Amino acid sequence: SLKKGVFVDDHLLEKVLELNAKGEKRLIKTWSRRSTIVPEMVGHTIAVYNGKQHVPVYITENMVGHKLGEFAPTRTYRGHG
Amino acid sequence: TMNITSKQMEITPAIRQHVADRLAKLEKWQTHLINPHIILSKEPQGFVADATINTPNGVLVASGKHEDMYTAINELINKLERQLNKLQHKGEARR
Amino acid sequence: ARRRRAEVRQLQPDLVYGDVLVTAFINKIMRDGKKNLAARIFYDACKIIQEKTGQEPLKVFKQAVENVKPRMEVRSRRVGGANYQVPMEVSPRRQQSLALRWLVQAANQRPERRAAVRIAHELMDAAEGKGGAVKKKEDVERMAEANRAYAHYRW
Amino acid sequence: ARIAGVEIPRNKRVDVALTYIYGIGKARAKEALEKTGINPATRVKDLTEAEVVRLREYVENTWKLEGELRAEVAANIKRLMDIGCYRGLRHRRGLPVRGQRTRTNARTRKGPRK
Amino acid sequence: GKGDRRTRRGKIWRGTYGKYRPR
Amino acid sequence: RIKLRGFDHKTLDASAQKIVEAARRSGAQVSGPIPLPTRVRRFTVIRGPFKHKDSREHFELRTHNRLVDIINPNRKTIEQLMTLDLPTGVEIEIKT
Amino acid sequence: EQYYGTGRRKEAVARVFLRPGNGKVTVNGQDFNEYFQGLVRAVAALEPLRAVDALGHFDAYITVRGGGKSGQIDAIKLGIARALVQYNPDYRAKLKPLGFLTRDARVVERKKYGKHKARRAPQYS
Amino acid sequence: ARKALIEKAKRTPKFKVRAYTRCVRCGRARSVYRFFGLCRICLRELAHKGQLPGVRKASW
RNA sequence: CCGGGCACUCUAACGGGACUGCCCGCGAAAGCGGGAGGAAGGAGGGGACGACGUCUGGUCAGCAUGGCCCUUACGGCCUGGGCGACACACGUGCUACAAUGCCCACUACAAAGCGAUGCCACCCGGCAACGGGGAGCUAAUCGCAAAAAGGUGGGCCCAGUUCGGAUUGGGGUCUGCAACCCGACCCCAUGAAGCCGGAAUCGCUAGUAAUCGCGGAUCAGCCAUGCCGCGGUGAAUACG
Ligand SMILES: [Mg+2]
Ligand SMILES: [Mg+2]
Ligand SMILES: [Mg+2]
Ligand SMILES: [Mg+2]
Ligand SMILES: [Mg+2]
Ligand SMILES: [Mg+2]
Ligand SMILES: [Mg+2]
Ligand SMILES: [Mg+2]
Ligand SMILES: [Mg+2]
Ligand SMILES: [Mg+2]
Ligand SMILES: [Mg+2]
Ligand SMILES: [Mg+2]
Ligand SMILES: [Mg+2]
Ligand SMILES: [Mg+2]
Ligand SMILES: [Mg+2]
Ligand SMILES: [Mg+2]
Ligand SMILES: [Mg+2]
Ligand SMILES: [Mg+2]
Ligand SMILES: [Mg+2]
Ligand SMILES: [Mg+2]
Ligand SMILES: [Mg+2]
Ligand SMILES: [Mg+2]
Ligand SMILES: [Mg+2]
Ligand SMILES: [Mg+2]
Ligand SMILES: [Mg+2]
Ligand SMILES: [Mg+2]
Ligand SMILES: [Mg+2]
Ligand SMILES: [Mg+2]
Ligand SMILES: [Mg+2]
Ligand SMILES: [Zn+2]
């Protein structure tokens, strides 16, 4: 899915290619689950919204083509019974 | 199996198994009770309990109505029992 | 059929032997409206009915039909507290219908891989008095008989 | 064994017989009977092991394959169950993946019911 | 068959074209 | 060729005879009204405001076309037809 | 030279030309045998010709459009039947009681709302 | 969230995906017809009233 | 295809024809049986239409409307999540368990519809989805279009299989601002359950059921196997 273009919001895109430039920090809060994890993100802690909470995800080169939402899941399940 | 629908009401696991228990009375007749369905419902006068059940010899349908929910349910089973004894004994007039 | 009597349709005779009994049969072979299919089967079988046991496939067919039609059958009434299987004669209408039906039905239970062969063979044997169909006939007929004494509850 | 990732398929046609290997479908099958010019209708039984050794050698060296694949494959799940992943966290629960409803059905992924 | 994407009858039901039911 | 459109076919066919048989006197050779296949728009709608999906009434919209040809124009058939008796809706077409 | 009749069964129209000859028949530009191969109902709508004991008397030029092969046949039926009765209309007798003319009015029924296939209703409790 | 809704479908916002037919009479999003500008209910009322040009009970 | 023609087929507007009117038979009559002619007879088939009322049926969430309730909040905008959660239980349906079948390749015969920031001929790249170019059409005059089952002849040979296509791995396409949750399609690999189904239970009386494909609304796309239509092939049986 998604053929030619590589989709990152150009809102958190900006934020990552700044923090990397001067003295790289952490704690970037975002509500964009739609954003690809682009190799410039590799390592960081980004706070991703599942809709009631901003869930932090350490980035690793393990996961790149994915979306930032996949790692902050929307449902609290735990079981039945 | 047995399904219960609490319609426009907040019901509970405890009262659900109570209605499962009251319906158990029809097990007396030793005849298959097929996918029974009770519906509990409020009303300004009082509660309402409906049930519709099919058995090898026919189907049972009935409404209980009453102030107390529990006496409505009892009323429902009371009406159902009758219908069930009738499906079970009806042609015995076999002379 | 509350009201009057229910018409029995007549049937277009067939374009090979010009005989109604064949189309009824082909009708009974038919499945999901595919009639062309239902035809070749009967005729292919008719190839085979001549090929092996050289004869007149019409003859063989029309023979094994008379070898199937049940003369007497049970139809069960409730009297008092028991359901009696009751002896009654089958109408020529019903015998045809029961003839063709068991024929096919028993045909399709044969072990032969190709349908027309199954049709071929079942008919050849029924002509001779052997087979699933014929049994069902003799069977139905012994189940009548033995009930001869319920022949008074007869409509 | 016989051939390829060590299945053995005698007595039926070769385009089919090859399917009986992991990784080889009706698609990959028709390929290699072209590239080796072995004639797909010939049943394995009449091979000329010459053809067979040719058949083995291409298929064996070209893609991957019995016991591989499913090793390599499973490794992705062990990856995807490792990373985040959601669709990862769903293999971890033996639950369906591709967005099907879980309220009903879903029995292939859940097994018979109780 | 009608459910099997890899076949003619497959694609017909599904209303699409591909290698197995081409245009 | 003059094409006629519009919904009521009674209104239309009245003014297919008007226009055609007008230019019969004032022109020639007036190739008669030719009915085109009518384009139907069906609307099936659920009868009630609420559930009840098995009760519905069908509503259609009948838009029918007529073509009429006048062989030799005879300009001033381009006047006697440069107005005419309408009626209240219909679609006139003219081209060569 | 010629003899005409118009056949129809179920959204199908046959134009039949009874022009006299060997008995060759052409349907949409090829012999009966090429256009209906297989189908056994094809043996035929030619039945009207065998009805008045003429077999080869006439050839037939036939166009047929609409419906599908069987429907097309039954149209040819009232075709060669309507054409032949025109030729010598002492021909109604033995064609008519043999039920040859008289096109069957049996057609597909409208699908109705709330039902599925126009009669088959959906399942309930 | 209701009458504000009918207003929100009027001026056409950020993306064109967000376009959805509402209807002119009732603010109904569901079962709006493009050709009429109407819901299936509103459509019915008007048709029956005779206010829809050349629109008639079908019947074949 | 041109000339030429409206005979055809058709198209779509207006008429005709069926009346138990005619014969026999019965009846007190109404009317029933049978016959003739007729494309059609006994209401020719299907539709639209559905009494006074019933269910204190249904809908305040389509709309309206009395009354009660909330007024930096029970109002209003937004990003995101959810409405798709899954131990389970029921209802409607799809595809199947195969040889009257499955697959390939060639070859036929519809109807109703729908198309301008739409329907895309045809040419080319691509296994393909698709992507390039690019003609026609305000559309009986262009396009969606292929209808499908069927027909032909070839493979399969009873195998959980060349039955069935679930599930999953990986690679792509398109819509869209965006396909984590959550789209559809295409290709490769994977080929689950399922060998015809307990108690129980549904539909259909003829161009009907069964079976086969096609269109449309809504719609960017689409979770449509749904719904509303459309033709193709075409049965069984009704003593009662
Ligand atoms: Mg491979
Ligand atoms: Mg899904
Ligand atoms: Mg398959
Ligand atoms: Mg099928
Ligand atoms: Mg149909
Ligand atoms: Mg209808
Ligand atoms: Mg429904
Ligand atoms: Mg219902
Ligand atoms: Mg939208
Ligand atoms: Mg004329
Ligand atoms: Mg009336
Ligand atoms: Mg009430
Ligand atoms: Mg309101
Ligand atoms: Mg919002
Ligand atoms: Mg929902
Ligand atoms: Mg179940
Ligand atoms: Mg379904
Ligand atoms: Mg044109
Ligand atoms: Mg298996
Ligand atoms: Mg298989
Ligand atoms: Mg899949
Ligand atoms: Mg994948
Ligand atoms: Mg198994
Ligand atoms: Mg088997
Ligand atoms: Mg069954
Ligand atoms: Mg079956
Ligand atoms: Mg009826
Ligand atoms: Mg759509
Ligand atoms: Mg569809
Ligand atoms: Zn509205």
Side-chain angles (χ1 to χ4, degrees), chain A residues 1 4-9 11 17 21 23 28-36 39-41 43-44 46-51 54 56 58-60 63-67 69-81, chain B residues 1-66 68-95, chain C residues 1-3 5-6 8-9 11 13-46 50-52 54-58 60-61 63-68 70-74 76 79-82 84 86-89 91-95 97-113 115-129 131-134 136-147 149-155, chain D residues 1-5 9 13-27 29 32-33 36-37 39-42 44 46 48 50-55 58-60 62-71 73-77 84-88 90-91 93-113, chain E, chain F residues 4-9 11-12 14-17 22-23 27-28 30-52 54-66 68-69 73 87 89-93 96, chain G residues 2-8 10-21 23 25-30 33 35-40 42 44-45 47-48 51 54 56 58-76 79 81-83 85-87 89 93 97-100 102-109 111-114 116 118-119 121-123, chain H residues 1-9 12-13 15-60:
Chain A
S1 303
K4 56 265 198 278
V6 167
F7 183 86
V8 50
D9 271 314
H11 92 67
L17 279 201
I28 184 251
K29 276 183 290 178
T30 189
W31 314 232
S32 48
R33 319 181 47 75
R34 11 139 51 162
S35 312
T36 305
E40 282 67 16
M41 290 149 175
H44 262 135
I46 311 176
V48 193
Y49 207 48
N50 52 25
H54 275 323
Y58 180 67
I59 304 84
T60 68
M63 17 107 157
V64 160
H66 299 134
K67 265 71 168 193
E70 312 197 7
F71 310 69
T74 53
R75 281 155 186 126
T76 64
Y77 181 47
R78 268 155 220 182
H80 260 109
Chain B
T1 76
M2 167 175 331
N3 315 95
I4 308 151
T5 282
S6 185
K7 170 175 172 170
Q8 301 168 225
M9 267 192 324
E10 266 308 84
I11 206 53
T12 142
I15 108 124
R16 278 171 179 265
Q17 185 65 11
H18 180 71
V19 28
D21 283 333
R22 299 326 258 85
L23 219 245
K25 266 155 130 280
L26 313 183
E27 274 179 13
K28 195 222 297 180
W29 278 266
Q30 295 164 39
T31 180
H32 186 191
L33 305 149
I34 325 201
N35 298 309
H37 170 45
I38 329 282
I39 301 118
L40 273 19
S41 15
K42 252 172 176 97
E43 218 212 71
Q45 325 294 97
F47 293 91
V48 179
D50 296 273
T52 103
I53 311 156
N54 179 59
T55 72
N57 306 314
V59 353
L60 310 166
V61 195
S63 168
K65 310 166 244 177
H66 192 266
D68 197 3
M69 181 197 311
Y70 292 113
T71 315
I73 293 163
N74 268 329
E75 165 115 335
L76 205 209
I77 309 295
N78 251 274
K79 316 213 192 186
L80 287 175
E81 272 178 22
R82 190 93 181 277
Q83 292 184 30
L84 183 49
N85 201 60
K86 188 203 282 225
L87 308 189
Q88 298 304 110
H89 308 325
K90 197 174 175 283
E92 278 157 24
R94 52 158 120 87
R95 55 141 292 200
Chain C
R2 289 242 199 247
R3 273 194 165 293
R5 216 161 145 148
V8 205
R9 300 183 197 251
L11 330 89
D14 85 280
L15 313 105
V16 180
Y17 304 78
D19 162 57
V20 296
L21 202 46
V22 181
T23 52
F25 196 83
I26 291 164
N27 281 160
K28 271 304 188 172
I29 310 176
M30 203 194 340
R31 235 97 103 135
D32 312 339
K34 305 169 106 188
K35 206 203 193 85
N36 210 32
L37 197 40
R40 328 147 121 291
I41 315 190
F42 181 76
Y43 299 128
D44 272 274
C46 293
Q50 197 284 99
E51 300 314 306
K52 316 164 81 185
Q55 241 171 304
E56 217 73 293
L58 176 134
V60 199
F61 177 67
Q63 187 45 261
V65 145
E66 218 71 351
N67 281 340
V68 162
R71 299 183 289 272
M72 204 79 73
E73 72 167 351
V74 276
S76 48
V79 207
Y84 296 141
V86 169
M88 291 202 67
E89 43 288 291
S91 63
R93 170 61 199 172
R94 173 122 162 108
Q95 278 178 77
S97 355
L98 291 177
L100 313 153
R101 202 184 311 164
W102 300 335
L103 238 338
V104 180
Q105 289 208 227
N108 276 339
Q109 278 186 333
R110 279 193 138 268
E112 350 285 57
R113 300 227 210 258
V117 180
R118 277 200 301 270
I119 308 289
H121 296 176
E122 179 64 30
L123 279 162
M124 284 180 63
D125 271 11
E128 296 198 10
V134 198
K136 228 300 189 188
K137 178 252 215 305
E138 292 169 346
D139 269 17
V140 159
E141 279 193 329
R142 262 190 314 298
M143 226 299 131
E145 232 326 300
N147 289 27
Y150 294 131
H152 67 306
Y153 286 158
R154 186 181 44 187
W155 44 109
Chain D
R2 176 80 83 270
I3 193 220
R13 313 187 3 170
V14 259
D15 50 328
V16 174
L18 269 352
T19 306
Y20 286 84
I21 319 146
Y22 203 67
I24 289 86
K26 185 65 113 298
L33 310 161
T36 75
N39 180 32
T42 77
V44 184
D46 326 320
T48 101
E51 285 159 77
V52 146
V53 168
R54 196 183 328 146
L55 237 161
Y58 180 82
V59 196
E60 286 229 39
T62 312
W63 335 256
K64 79 159 153 164
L65 255 242
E66 283 271 30
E68 236 342 290
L69 237 184
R70 37 151 139 249
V73 162
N76 301 20
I77 322 242
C85 157
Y86 193 77
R87 168 170 96 97
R90 301 278 277 183
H91 278 99
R93 267 195 214 80
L95 254 234
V97 175
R98 314 189 148 187
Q100 306 122 296
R101 69 194 273 94
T102 40
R103 171 125 156 169
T104 64
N105 314 326
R107 295 303 147 182
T108 325
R109 191 120 250 259
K110 284 169 82 167
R113 65 197 103 196
Chain E
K2 288 191 189 165
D4 179 15
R5 307 205 158 81
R6 317 282 187 92
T7 62
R8 241 254 288 181
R9 194 121 303 274
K11 255 124 179 62
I12 302 179
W13 190 101
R14 214 113 224 155
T16 48
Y17 305 82
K19 193 157 63 176
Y20 302 110
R21 181 223 189 198
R23 310 181 154 275
Chain F
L4 296 190
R5 256 190 299 287
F7 298 136
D8 187 347
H9 78 61
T11 67
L12 164 136
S15 46
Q17 233 273 309
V30 299
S31 244
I34 73 188
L36 275 200
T38 301
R39 292 283 261 239
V40 164
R41 177 154 270 140
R42 306 257 170 92
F43 317 86
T44 285
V45 64
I46 286 67
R47 286 227 173 193
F50 209 32
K51 91 296 228 279
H52 303 339
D54 297 328
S55 204
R56 290 174 203 207
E57 70 184 312
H58 303 288
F59 273 133
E60 49 193 37
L61 171 52
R62 295 285 207 86
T63 123
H64 354 227
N65 325 295
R66 310 275 170 108
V68 291
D69 276 349
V90 104
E91 191 135 272
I92 353 86
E93 231 70 293
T96 151
Chain G
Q2 261 165 179
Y3 301 92
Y4 190 65
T6 301
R8 310 182 170 103
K10 295 162 55 185
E11 316 286 318
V13 220
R15 295 161 44 199
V16 187
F17 293 149
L18 262 205
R19 39 177 73 181
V25 179
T26 284
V27 188
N28 261 28
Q30 62 237 78
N33 294 338
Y35 189 68
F36 327 105
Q37 156 174 23
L39 31 141
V40 202
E47 199 64 356
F58 327 101
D59 270 41
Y61 181 72
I62 289 165
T63 159
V64 81
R65 297 116 89 278
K69 304 264 184 174
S70 191
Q72 281 175 11
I73 298 182
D74 277 8
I76 290 187
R82 277 177 150 188
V85 302
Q86 189 225 46
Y87 165 117
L98 215 52
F100 271 98
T102 183
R103 149 221 213 285
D104 71 43
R106 298 149 3 105
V107 226
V108 148
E109 241 183 279
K111 176 194 174 319
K112 286 95 152 194
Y113 57 107
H116 285 345
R119 279 168 179 199
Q123 289 187 0
Chain H
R2 175 55 176 66
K3 182 193 169 188
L5 252 67
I6 74 188
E7 252 73 342
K8 192 157 56 175
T12 308
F15 323 87
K16 59 172 173 90
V17 241
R18 303 203 182 168
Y20 69 98
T21 28
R22 200 72 88 140
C23 152
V24 263
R25 295 192 60 173
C26 52
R28 183 152 181 139
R30 288 201 150 102
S31 287
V32 267
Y33 276 92
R34 292 179 156 187
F35 182 103
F36 279 107
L38 291 190
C39 46
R40 74 151 202 272
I41 308 172
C42 305
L43 159 39
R44 192 171 185 247
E45 279 141 16
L46 292 180
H48 276 303
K49 223 143 61 137
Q51 289 189 6
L52 292 204
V55 183
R56 183 178 186 154
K57 276 182 72 65
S59 187
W60 72 103

